[PDB]
Amino acid sequence: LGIPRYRPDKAETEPQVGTAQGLAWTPVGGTLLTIEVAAVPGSGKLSLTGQLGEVMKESAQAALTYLRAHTQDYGLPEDFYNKVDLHVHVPDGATPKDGPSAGITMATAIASALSRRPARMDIAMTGEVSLRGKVMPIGGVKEKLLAAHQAGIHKIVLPKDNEAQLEELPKEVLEGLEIKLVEDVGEVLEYLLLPEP
Amino acid sequence: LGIPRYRPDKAETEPQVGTAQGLAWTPVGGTLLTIEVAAVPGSGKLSLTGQLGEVMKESAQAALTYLRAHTQ
Amino acid sequence: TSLGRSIARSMNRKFHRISLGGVRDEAEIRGHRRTYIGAMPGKLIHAMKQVGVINPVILLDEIDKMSSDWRGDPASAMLEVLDPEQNNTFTDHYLDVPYDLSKVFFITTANTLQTIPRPLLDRMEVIEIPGYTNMEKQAIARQY
Amino acid sequence: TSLGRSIARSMNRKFHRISLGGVRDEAEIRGHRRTYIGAMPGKLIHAMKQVGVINPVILLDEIDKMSSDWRG
Amino acid sequence: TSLGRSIARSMNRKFHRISLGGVRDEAEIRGHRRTYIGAMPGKLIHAMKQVGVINPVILLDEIDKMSSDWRG
C-alpha cells in the first residue's frame, strides 16, 4: 500500500500550551479537532480563525468570565481583557451539530494560552457549556467514542448527566476507555493541563 | 421505556445561586427560560447575550434602575 | 519588487502586487454579504481574477501597513492565505467555499520589522536589506 | 484650459474634456453590465466616442475630485 | 414668473413653463429607448409641440432641487 494517510497517536497535541485536541462531530463518522489558542499581548479584543461560528465567540466570553472569576485558582493574570487579543484556532467552524460540541475543550485550550502551561495528551473530551461553569449534557456519544477508539485515545471525559448512557451501548468498547466523571469545566482543567496552576 | 429523561415531577434544583427560570410562550407552547446573568469586576458597561432585542436592554436598564433605588 | 520579478524570472509564472495598505476592514479584502445592490467580492478574489492561473508569483505590498477597526485581524487571514491548507479553511464574506491558494507562490514586501503582525511573526524570517553604497550606486549607475 | 487648447493647436489634433468631479462608481468609469438594455460605457468611453479618431488629447478635469464608493 | 410673462408680452412670444425639481435621469427631458411606445421626448420638446413658434421663452423652474440618482 505504500504511504499512510492517517496519523499515529497524539503527535500534534504533545502536551502543549498552544494546542488542545477535542472530539468532533460528523453524522457520517466522527472526527476530533485540535484547537489552537495563542495568547498574544494586545488590547483585549477578540479574533476568530477557521471560518467560525459566533457562538464559539460567545462561549469564549463565557469561559473567559469563568477565568475572570477564578484567576487565583490558577494564578492567572488579572487583566487580559484589555491586554490580550485572542486568535483562537478551531478548524472548520460553525458546526452542523448546531452550536457547540466541545466547549469544554475550547475553555481548556484558552485557559492553556492564558496559563502558558502545557496540556495533557491521551485525553479527549466533548461537552456543552454555560456561564456558571456547568457542563451541559450531550446526545449520542457513540461517534466521539468511536473515533477516539480509532484515535487510540483511552481517557475520554464526559458530562456527569450522560452517566446513564453507559447502560445502553456495548460495554466492550466502553470499559477499554478510562472514565473520569466531570460536571464542571474546572474539573477538566485540573485533569487536562500538565500543571495545576 | 429506558432511563428517565427528566425529573420526576420536579422536586430539586439545588436552589438558585445566581440564576432564575422564566415562563414564556413559544407559539408551540411555552417553556421555562432559566436565565443566566454573569457579574465580573468590570467598567459599568453592559452585556446582553442570547439573541435579545433592545427591549431587553430597556428592561435591564429599568430593572437595574429599580435596584439603584433599592441598594441599601 | 524587481527581486520578486526576478523570482518570477526563475519560475516562468504570472506575477502580481497588491497593496495591504489602504485596508481598514475585512470586507474590503473579502466581499460583502449579498445584502444590498452591488455585492461584489473583495480584493482577493478579483486579484485572483487578475491571475490567469492558480500558480502565480505573488508579491504583497505593505504587509506591515494595514488597519482593521473591527474584530480580529486580517493578518490572521494573511496567515490563512499563507497556508495552502488554511485556504481550504479561508473565510469568505461573499462567496461560500474557501478558495485554495496552494500553488500560489508567496513572497511579500514590507518596510518595517517593528510593526509586523504578531499573527504573522510565525513563518516569517525578517532579513534586513541594507541600503546602497556610493560605490554600489555608481556600479548600478554605469551598469544599468 | 488654454494651455490644453494651445497645445492642441500646436500638435494639430483635437482637444477634448471630461470632468472628474462627482464620479464615485468605477462602473461609472468603466462600462455597465451588458446584460440588459440600459447598459452604458463610462463617460470616459463616451468622451472617446465624441472624438472620431484614435489619437486625441484628453484632459482630465480635476482628477482629485472623485471618491471611493461602491461597485468598485 | 410674471416678470418673464411681462417680457413675453413685450416680445411677441408664447410663454411656457416646465418644472425641473424632481427628475434624476436623462430619460425624461432626454429621449427614452425608442424601441417601444413610451419613448416620449423632453418637457422642452413637449413645449415645442405646444408652442407654434421656433422662438419661445422657456421658463426654467427650480434647478437647485433637481438631482441625478440613476446613471445619466
The domain tally of chain A equals 1
Phi-psi region of A162 (alpha: psi -120 to 50; beta: other; left: phi over 0): alpha
How was this model experimentally determined?
Answer: cryo-EM
> CA nearest C43 in D: which residue?
D72
Q: How far is A3 from chain B (nearest CA, A)?
A: 46
- Longest Cα pair distance anywhere in chain D, in angstroms? 43
CA distances from A185 to A103, A145, A158 (A): 9, 19, 11
Spatial distance between the Cα atoms of C74 and C120, rounded to a whole number of angstroms = 10
Asked if the structure places residue A197 within a domain, the reply is no
Q: Which chains touch B (3 or more CB pairs under 8 A)?
A: A
Taking the alpha carbons at both ends of chain E, their separation in whole angstroms is 29
Spatial distance between the Cα atoms of D49 and C38, rounded to a whole number of angstroms = 27
Q: How far is C74 from chain D (nearest CA, A)?
A: 20
- Which residues, numbered 12 to 71 in chain B, qualify as contacts with chain A under a Cβ-Cβ cut-off of 8 Å? 17-19, 36-38, 40-41, 47, 49
SS3 C40: coil
Q: How far is D14 from chain C (nearest CA, A)?
A: 34
Residue with cell 501597513: C65
Question: By the 8 A CB rule, do A122 and A178 touch?
Answer: no
> CA nearest C40 in D: which residue?
D71
Q: Which long-range contacts (CB under 8 A, 24 or more apart) does D25-33 make?
A: D25/D69, D25/D70, D25/D71, D25/D72, D26/D71, D26/D72, D27/D71, D27/D72, D28/E71, D30/D72, D32/E71
Which residues of chain B lie closer than 8 angstroms to A56, CB-CB? none
Size of the D and E interface in Cβ pairs below 8 Å: 7
Asked if the structure places residue A8 within a domain, the reply is no
Chain C touched by A171 (CB under 8 Å)? no
Size of the A and B interface in Cβ pairs below 8 Å: 23
- Alpha helices, DSSP H, located in D18-67: 26-29, 43-50
Residue range(s) defining the domain that contains residue A151 = 19-192
Spatial distance between the Cα atoms of A162 and A179, rounded to a whole number of angstroms = 12
- Say if residue E5 carries a ligand binding annotation: yes
Answer positive or negative: Cα dihedral of C70, A43, C43, D58. positive
Residue range(s) defining the domain that contains residue C37 = 1-128
Chain C touched by D72 (CB under 8 Å)? yes
Are E72 and D38 inside 8 Å of each other by CB?
no
Taking the alpha carbons at both ends of chain B, their separation in whole angstroms is 53
Are A49 and C72 inside 8 Å of each other by CB?
yes
Residue with cell 427631458: E29
Are B2 and A168 inside 8 Å of each other by CB?
yes
Asked if the structure places residue A1 within a domain, the reply is no
Spatial distance between the Cα atoms of E41 and E52, rounded to a whole number of angstroms = 17
User: Helices A103-115 and A54-69 sit at what angle, rounded to 10 degrees?
Assistant: 50
Chain A touched by B3 (CB under 8 Å)? yes
Question: By the 8 A CB rule, do C22 and C74 touch?
Answer: no
- Count of alpha carbons within 13 Å of C115, Cβ hemisphere only? 10
- Count of alpha carbons within 13 Å of A23, Cβ hemisphere only? 29
Q: What is the CATH number of the domain that holds C27?
A: 3.40.50.300
Asked if the structure places residue A11 within a domain, the reply is no
Spatial distance between the Cα atoms of C77 and A33, rounded to a whole number of angstroms = 20
Spatial distance between the Cα atoms of A43 and B67, rounded to a whole number of angstroms = 32
Q: What is the CATH number of the domain that holds A64?
A: 3.30.230.10
C-alpha of A21 from chain center: 6
Spatial distance between the Cα atoms of A36 and A44, rounded to a whole number of angstroms = 18
Asked if the structure places residue A13 within a domain, the reply is no
* 3-class DSSP string for chain B: CCCCCCCCCCCCCCCCCCEECCCCCCCCCCCCCCEECCCCCCCCCCCCCCCCCHHHHHHHHHHHHHHHCCCC
